[PDB]
Amino acid sequence: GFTDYKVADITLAAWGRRELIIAESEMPALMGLRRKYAGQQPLKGAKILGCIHMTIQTGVLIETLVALGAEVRWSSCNIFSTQDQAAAAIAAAGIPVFAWKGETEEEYEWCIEQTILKDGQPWDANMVLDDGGDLTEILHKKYPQMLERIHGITEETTTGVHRLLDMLKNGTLKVPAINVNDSVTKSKNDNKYGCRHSLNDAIKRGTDHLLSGKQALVIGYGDVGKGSSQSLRQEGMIVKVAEVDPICAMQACMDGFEVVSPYKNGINDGTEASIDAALLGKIDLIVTTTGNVNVCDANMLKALKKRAVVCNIGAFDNEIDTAFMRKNWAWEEVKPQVHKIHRTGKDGFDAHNDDYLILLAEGRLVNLGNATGHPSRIMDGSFANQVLAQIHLFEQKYADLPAAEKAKRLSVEVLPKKLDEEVALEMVKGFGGVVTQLTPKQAEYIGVSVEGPFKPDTYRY
Template sequence: MKIEWALNHMPVVASLMNNCKKEKPFEGITISAVLHVTKETAVLVKALKECGARVLLAGSNPLSTQDDVAAALAKDGIEVYAWKGETEEEYFWAIRKIIEDGNPDIVIDDGGDLHVTIHKEYPQLAEKIIGGTEETTTGVIRLKAMEKDGVLKYPVIAVNDALTKFMFDNRYGTGQSTIDGILRATNVLIAGKKVVVAGYGWCGRGIAMRMRGMGARVIVTEVDPLRALEAVHDGFDVMPMDDAAKVGDIFVTATGNINVIRKEHFLKMKNGAILANAGHFNVEIDVKSLEALAVSKRRIRPYVDEYKLPDGRKIYLLAEGRLVNLVAAEGHPSEVMDMSFANQFLSVKYLIENKGKLEPKVYKVPHEIDSEVARRKLNAMGIKIDTLTEEQKRYLESW
């Protein structure tokens, strides 16, 4: 039922699936994917299967898998190796399983662990892979580093960098679902709270915007002067984390970097401060330092751990420092994942159609794919737009 609900709210992916059911462009192609196993992901992998692919799926976070969705996909012929609450060892076992059992032609990743594992442990397999895609900012950063170091062995399309992905998924999806996760975990009132958002990329923008919409007084911390300046002009207070730590009630990290909130910040926080992470990996909040500082730790609600410091102050960590929107809630709404996963679907199709023509580099999503996704989404929403006249086209092409 959850998958059916998602499909009903993902008209772009549904239309792509219906268009290619007969021609089956992915016939004979094996796809290994590491994604958050949610109802929206189920729609994507079912679409790939309906269009001819063999699909193997592992989770991209030990705590984000929806077990009922994984079970439903397994019954439907998807080879799923994911369950909620995996250990780190089990998490990487599942990734190796979909590599070894699949011997994939195409790889789809969210975070970069699949790409990195293939390159480090299965270099011969990497040589025969047609190409891959990457769903999130963290993974794209890692892949660009691999390209820079000259170790990337196949072309990868940075789906995260598609306009119809990051401007909507990262901003509106992360903005809404992060608050959803915080509220489900804590049920605190957002209005009147001082919320510190670390990072003003597209995810940070979305979180800050939505927090303000719920009545929070938002503070942004940044290392990039341009983004900091933008946050100021968007009406937010901007200050270093050292200063924000003293006044914040709720802290949300969304940077893709390590130890953004660390020991010196914990020591300055108010009693009752709440910490949440919206970045892909559980490295943005220095949990090890918090564990070392605390004299006691206890779980007081699902996904809420209380750390008591030597002076009696209490700090509350949500979702063990992992993605709060996918651990404590359901992740992004189906409507926004519709565009992200339409980009995934069309990027896989593009890689297959251009087999052997692309160098082992990180590529942007082709503009025609971005435009096609936007057109299909507008059509599904019943929205029409203008088109250029021939005279207008000639005018824009002239100098």
């Protein structure tokens, strides 16, 4: 028997497999790569450490990497994001996976360690697929010898890419990386439209609250903030937006949102006097989207309207000051990943107290913690990029290069625009969309190939 896994319930595997078969039909770009490359086995010999939300969508990614010849050892990059039926289906296929919904922090770290170690010794990994950079950091700090044999890292998300660029600037990055996030078929698909789909989904599953007619404050208006604001406005919320970037704030104004600060004149002096108590006393829902720290701070939480919902769809659990809430206020679990936080004091609560907030997913990614994250047809884009990135770095064989050649290739790069366009075309055909083919006269006129690429690398879409 296969035993090299740890999942909540292996008996969920048949359900997981039914959902994987549906997901394949929703992921034409990823299934296109399976069909194109299966014969050629471009990841034969690849041994991939994977750390990304163990969802049905990640299951189709894993089985694509395996279909192209890879071996993998997998964990989730978040304690609440695993779909237990997806983890079970992957374990039942004989793939090492260590993931369940509702891990402790200690279990989270143990699951990553179970991917790194096989039978008590470092696995002979030669590739990394990461979401958020925790596995990347553990390899660099705790297993630096393993990075001598690793050809590359493919990084999913905005925050993970920031961490790679910090290592590259400091000369501590040991292997090259592909920034998957900044493909247009990732950043301007997943980060925006994924949150559009999944933020209102997660709030409805957690609370079943009406959103129409209520007041929201979205902190941030990057790709996640844009999609989150639309998720709420399209339901009929009155959405206000906070930003530190005046260009993003300009976009929020033109998109029909009022731009406000939680702080008087936008200045946080650290005192309660700097809080716009009148603004926050009218807010029914706060959503953090920044990838920054303490953007929904203790003084903001004290000033929020009674019975406001608080949630985070960006970075870790520290966009909201959940540590302040754990120390000072009394938590009542409604159901998993839904807590009433009683502002009456730190110990006991009255079941009928009216002065509480509702926190979703303990301040962790709400779309994955309270629903199922982005849908298959959106993750198709992200995960087709991940597969292309794995193929590219594995074929370059960085770990085998002489030192002089390594020095030239030690970088954090995006995939070429031609590949971003090829992913997009498969996504468009999935919708039954028909792209026009330029005439040679038209291609000459605008200075492009009929085949593309269609835009210069400066183009922002």
